[PDB]
Amino acid sequence: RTDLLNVCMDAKHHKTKPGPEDKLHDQCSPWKKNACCTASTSQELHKDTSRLYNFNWDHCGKMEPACKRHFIQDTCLYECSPNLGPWIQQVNQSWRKERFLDVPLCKEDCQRWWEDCHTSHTCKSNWHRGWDWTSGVNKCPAGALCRTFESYFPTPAALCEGLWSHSYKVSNYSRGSGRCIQMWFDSAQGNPNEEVARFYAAAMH
Numbered sequence: 001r002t003d004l005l006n007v008c009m010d011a012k013h014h015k016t017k018p019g020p021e022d023k024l025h026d027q028c029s030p031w032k033k034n035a036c037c038t039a040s041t042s043q044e045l046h047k048d049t050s051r052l053y054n055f056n057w058d059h060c061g062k063m064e065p066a067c068k069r070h071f072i073q074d075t076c077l078y079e080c081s082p083n084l085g086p087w088i089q090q091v092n093q094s095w096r097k098e099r100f101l102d103v104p105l106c107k108e109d110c111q112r113w114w115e116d117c118h119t120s121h122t123c124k125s126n127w128h129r130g131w132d133w134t135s136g137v138n139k140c141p142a143g144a145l146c147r148t149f150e151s152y153f154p155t156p157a158a159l160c161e162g163l164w165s166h167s168y169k170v171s172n173y174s175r176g177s178g179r180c181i182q183m184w185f186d187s188a189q190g191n192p193n194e195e196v197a198r199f200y201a202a203a204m205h
């Protein structure tokens with residue numbers, strides 16, 4: 001149980017162990033007291049088609065700012081959170097040894113993300129597997145047309161759950177309940193996800 005608290009998963013850019021990073025950039029700054037990401041990672045992850053995975057958000061024309069801020073935020077959580085131990089699973093992949101499964105995302109964060117992305121476009125309902133990477137950057141593969149976000153993600157759950165192969169599930173608990181993981185939080189009273197990781201480590205046991 002306690003073994004699941006305050007760890008970093010074994011993945012491409014993660015630090016070995018959580019620790020302070022006073023210089024976390026922009027949207028990742030709320031993790032600055034305790035983070036699995038380096039300052040340099042936090043900086044690079046804000047960029048379009050960044051060097052972290054050469055991943056292009058603007059694969060079906062430009063993704064709108066109100067939408068892209070959520071993908072940036074989600075990447076801060078993925079690369080920086082020391083509070084997702086309870087959901088870590090082993091995986092066979094060339095670029096990471098572990099990933100997350102069924103992280104209980106607060107329903108409002110999923111809802112807000114889905115809504116803010118309605119005016120954006122994509123060509124796939126799962127962005128973890130199946131891209132054409134032959135150019136060095138992800139491109140829509142054979143059979144995959146550009147459509148409205150809603151076409152590929154007809155509900156908030158389809159976005160948050162389908163996007164990274166069920167790395168999230170949409171919790172029925174709300175932001176602030178201490179019973180779901182917040183993607184978006186300010187740090188004034190601490191990182192609220194610590195208490196959540198603590199609760200589920202024991203509750204899932």
Ligand SMILES: CN(Cc1cnc2nc(N)nc(N)c2n1)c1ccc(C(=O)N[C@@H](CCC(=O)O)C(=O)O)cc1
Nearest residue numbers: 053055074075078093094100127128129130131164167
């Ligand atoms: C967006 N990005 C970084 C990345 C990867 N996994 C995540 N997982 C979660 N839960 N959240 C993220 N933000 C996240 N981000 C990506 C996306 C695709 C590939 C990729 O190489 N996909 C190959 C699959 C490679 C493989 O066989 O493992 C493909 O088929 O398209 C790498 C990094």
Ligand SMILES: *[C@@H]1O[C@H](CO)[C@@H](O[C@@H]2O[C@H](CO)[C@@H](O)[C@H](O)[C@H]2NC(C)=O)[C@H](O)[C@H]1NC(C)=O
Nearest residue numbers: 088089090091092093094096097098099100101
């Ligand atoms: C990663 O790969 C290994 C090896 O293929 C998987 O383990 C095997 O699983 C099968 C059943 O699916 C067993 O019969 C074999 O004995 C296992 N082989 C070894 C070498 O352990 C493993 O399950 C994979 N991990 C995931 C999450 O799929």
Ligand SMILES: *[C@@H]1O[C@H](CO)[C@@H](O[C@@H]2O[C@H](CO)[C@@H](O)[C@H](O)[C@H]2NC(C)=O)[C@H](O)[C@H]1NC(C)=O
Nearest residue numbers: 105106107108170171172173174175177179180
């Ligand atoms: C998720 O949470 C909502 C809100 O807390 C739950 O809502 C209510 O459910 C009961 C009985 O099903 C109703 O009588 C109430 O009027 C509902 N409130 C609202 C505002 O809808 C909901 O049941 C929960 N979902 C699950 C699957 O447990």
Ligand SMILES: [Cl-]
Nearest residue numbers: 012051052053
């Ligand atoms: Cl590389």
Ligand SMILES: [Cl-]
Nearest residue numbers: 066069112116
């Ligand atoms: Cl706003």
Ligand SMILES: [K+]
Nearest residue numbers: 081082083193
């Ligand atoms: K966190």
